[PDB]
Design brief:
Chain G: The modification N6-(beta-hydroxybutyryl)lysine is found at residues 21, 44, 87. Chain G: This is Histone H3.3. Chain G: Belongs to the histone H3 family. The complex is a heterooctamer, with 2 copies of chain A, 2 copies of chain B, 2 copies of chain C and 2 copies of chain D. Chain A is mostly helical. Chain A has 5 helices and 3 strands; from the N terminus they run ααβαβααβ. The longest helix of chain A has 27 residues, at 33-59. Chain A is elongated. Chain C has 96 residues and is mainly alpha-helical. Chain C is extended, with a radius of gyration of 17 Å. The chains are: A mainly alpha (105), B mainly alpha (90), C mainly alpha (96), D mainly alpha (77). The interface between A and B is large, with 59 and 58 residues. Bound molecules: chloride ion (4 copies) and manganese (II) ion (MN) (13 copies). The site of one chloride ion has 3 residues of chain C, from α4. Chain G binds a DNA duplex (145 and 146 nucleotides) through residues 1-12, 14, 17, 28-31, 46, 48-51, 80-83.
Chain lengths: 105, 90, 96, 77, 92, 108, 99, 86
DNA sequence: TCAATATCCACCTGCAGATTCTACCAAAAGTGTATTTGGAAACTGCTCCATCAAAAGGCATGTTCAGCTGAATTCAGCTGAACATGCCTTTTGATGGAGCAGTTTCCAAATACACTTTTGGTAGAATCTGCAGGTGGATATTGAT
DNA sequence: ATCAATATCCACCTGCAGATTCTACCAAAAGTGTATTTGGAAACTGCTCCATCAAAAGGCATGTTCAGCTGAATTCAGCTGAACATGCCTTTTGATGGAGCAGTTTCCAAATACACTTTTGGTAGAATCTGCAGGTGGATATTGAT
């Protein structure tokens, strides 16, 4: 017995991704490599975000990542920020940022 | 109802073995994964249609990734995809 | 007896609320407003609590971002005080 | 009911938006804006709700409406 | 190498609304662009609608809902009238 | 096998129901497509086309012109609030812009 | 008689009316063509172009710049100025979510 | 057999051309620093569209950028363009 | 620079409660075969594309110079911030029940395809025609008298 | 309370490049007939939400005081617009040659199709441990008087 994800060296479900592609009304047919590739990409992005968010969680002396940590992680990363420029993260709040002119002296 | 929760958790344990995640944050990760899935699959679908191809392959996925992802994220994601396909194929 | 100068407490509040993530509008009035507006589109509607919550997160995120842009407009006009004029400029440039 | 969105709430929102000083005329203005926003989302949301032949607006209806306004929301799926 | 387009139908409509008016080739190109655009918007939204509700069939109801989501106000109401009337007549 | 009658003729439309149906079928939108869907869609597309051509024709006559050009389409769309909303993110090639000078810029 | 001379602004206003009335492309064709081919050459070499492709690029670019200048103008006027400055462009593009 | 190297063509977008564009945009008065600024902005814009366009061209295994490639790039950048689908 | 305050910020501990762990079981995924088929390779017919050429005039560039704009400054009216009081709205916690979602079964009705004809849509060819420019005279507007 | 000095409209005119109509073949609808799905109408049921009641806490509305910000008024020095001469280079039209799209045929590597059996992920309580609710005290900042 072997899963496709095991073979591809992935954690994300290749079979599921493949099935979602087939039933997603995207194309009449779906190639064997497409769900492997897609699953790999999704896993990679997830890994990057969890990496940074985990860093923020450790910085806040917490063992559990919360939405705030995800917001901090995403917005303080230029490319992740562009990728998610039109996305609202519930309970994420905003980056602390005060316009210099508003400060005293 | 299905979700990516267990896979997100596995990845989390890979990159931070002693770190957990709140329920809300997991919900946000699920939203994220579904969102990017739709962006990439949608773009790949359009790519296939424009070129009168009835099959979405890893090549459409790759091109779609290059269109949707910025800079370094695109390069690394492309690397991971190709690498995974190569390993799976082996 | 003590008195912080105008601006100090404002700034302190900015740091406080930018540090946190809690919803800033009271639940019940928002609920009331949402159900009221919704009645004008379709009648005898009900709402999941999560639906109302989604609406509130979205609304507050939107308003906060708008206030950021508004602030930028005011500062652009060499002011520290946001005015309806600033909001209107921001919304016009947004294509709202 | 629009008056239920009080002055200090709007001040809190502005503070989160980094605003240091606020004109008195802002609040009513803000309310108008808020109203419009809600009217736009809820409308679409309810549309989805009625397409599903339901009477209960779900979180997903809202999410789809926001998504279609390009106001994508994470966390309510 | 035959190419299809909405040109003749756009022209028929034009002759309906302005019997003594013509149209440049470029303006016709813009009209074709328009029709294809709105087609993709409506069909796409209807596809999503069908998927959200676990339905395998796009019907006139999906099309109608999509029209209501995509078009503003009176444009939407009028479009809905045209669509509904066309379907009711067609079935009969 | 009777005398053929087109779906567009039955629906009372100018726009091609059959073509629209085919495009729905091969556009990968859904596994199945109802009979009324392409009729409805064709009707809507036709209607929108009619509204825009109406306004653009009016604009063309306002310029003492008998042929609609892209400029007329722009005038029609931008001077109409709802069409402007519908096409808010659309560029009309060779359309130019609406004449509009900010009052403060005028001589004082 | 000193020769004729319009006051600063009059000819500017005249030009505004003129170009808002017309629809012709305002950038010279050949130099735009060169710019496009140069930039494209930096992504992929020995590319060719349909003439309509370049035309599409120019229509899009000019519509974009014109709209940008509208917003920029509003930003300048907001600050009680009549003269658009780089600050105005930067504000407009920031609020647009371009930066 | 091959054309002269394309160099510094962004300067081909002259001061009076930019002035004309601004006029259509309703601008009455223009700071001297605007033109260079504009050149930067346009440059970025083009880079973003053309990039995607070329991507489409490369996906189709073509060596010729078509109007449709451009149209698709503009569309995915939320810059929908009418009039070149023909 | 300074006493005299007020407010953050880190750190602490007791536990309520979110999160992680477990184990059951439909429902997906996997699997073993068996058949099809999309599209890539491989000519190849011809569009368009790239580049150059001449010439003519439209437009870019540099120059001069002064009007008027933007920037810098001054000042005080009155607006908006901060703070103290006390009322009431919202928050929080229950209870009851009906009004929606969500589900199964089963056939009538709706759709899917393939086969077989027909006809509306297309590509040039043959015709038709605005309108682009070209000319010129009234009307409007502008800046200095 | 006007004249010059320009720019802008407004009508008229006609040839031709662009639009429209005409022709006739044929791709793609339409008609027809079987094969498959599916829409819901009837009939149940656990639950979500709504309606109503209730206490109480903290958040808001209000009144007072005043600091300081916004807007008006003023002043000036350069910058940016207007105008003009030069001559470059864009535009226009066409030639020349071929790179590179498309069109057609051919045939397998890759994908779909079934019939069943494993494997897995969703679910809801148990078990496990982490934030958090407040409280302390030390760091950090602020304020007004010098
Ligand atoms: Cl593949
Ligand atoms: Cl105002
Ligand atoms: Cl239907
Ligand atoms: Cl500047
Ligand atoms: Mn280069
Ligand atoms: Mn066979
Ligand atoms: Mn084949
Ligand atoms: Mn000034
Ligand atoms: Mn004072
Ligand atoms: Mn016929
Ligand atoms: Mn003319
Ligand atoms: Mn045939
Ligand atoms: Mn079989
Ligand atoms: Mn088996
Ligand atoms: Mn398992
Ligand atoms: Mn702890
Ligand atoms: Mn605490």
């Amino acid at each position: 017995a072997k899963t496709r994800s095991s073979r591809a060296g992935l954690q994300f479900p290749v079979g599921r991704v493949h099935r979602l592609l087939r039933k997603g009304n995207y194309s009449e047919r779906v190639g064997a490599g497409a769900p492997v590739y897609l699953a790999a990409v999704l896993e990679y992005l997830t890994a990057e975000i969890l990496e940074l968010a985990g860093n923020a969680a450790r910085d806040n002396k917490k063992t559990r990542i919360i939405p705030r940590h995800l917001q901090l992680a995403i917005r303080n990363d230029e490319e992740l920020n562009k990728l998610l420029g039109r996305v609202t993260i519930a309970q994420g709040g905003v980056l602390p940022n005060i316009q210099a002119v508003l400060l005293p002296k | 109802k299905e979700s990516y929760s267990i896979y997100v958790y596995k990845v989390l344990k890979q990159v931070h073995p002693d770190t957990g995640i709140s329920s809300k944050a997991m919900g946000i990760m699920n939203s994220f994964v579904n969102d990017i899935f739709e962006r990439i699959a949608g773009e790949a679908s359009r790519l296939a249609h424009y070129n009168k191809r009835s099959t979405i392959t890893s090549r459409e996925i790759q091109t779609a990734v290059r269109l949707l992802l910025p800079g370094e994220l695109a390069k690394h994601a492309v690397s991971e995809g190709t690498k995974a396909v190569t390993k799976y194929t082996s | 007896p003590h008195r912080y100068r105008p601006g100090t407490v404002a700034l302190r509040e900015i740091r406080r609320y930018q540090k946190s993530t809690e919803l800033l509008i009271r639940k019940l009035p928002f609920q009331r407003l949402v159900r009221e507006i919704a009645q004008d589109f379709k009648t005898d509607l009900r709402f999941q609590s999560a639906a109302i919550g989604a609406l509130q997160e979205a609304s507050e995120a939107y308003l906060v971002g708008l206030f950021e842009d508004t602030n930028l407009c005011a500062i652009h006009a060499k002011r520290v005080t946001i005015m309806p004029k600033d909001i209107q400029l921001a919304r016009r440039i947004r294509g709202e | 009911n629009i008056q239920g969105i009080t002055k200090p709430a709007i001040r809190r929102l502005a503070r989160r938006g980094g605003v240091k000083r606020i004109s008195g005329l802002i609040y009513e203005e803000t309310r108008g804006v808020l109203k419009v926003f809600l009217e736009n989302v809820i409308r679409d949301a309810v549309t989805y709700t009625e397409h599903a032949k339901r009477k209960t607006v779900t979180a997903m209806d809202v999410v789809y409406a926001l998504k279609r306004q390009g106001r994508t929301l994470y966390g309510f799926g």
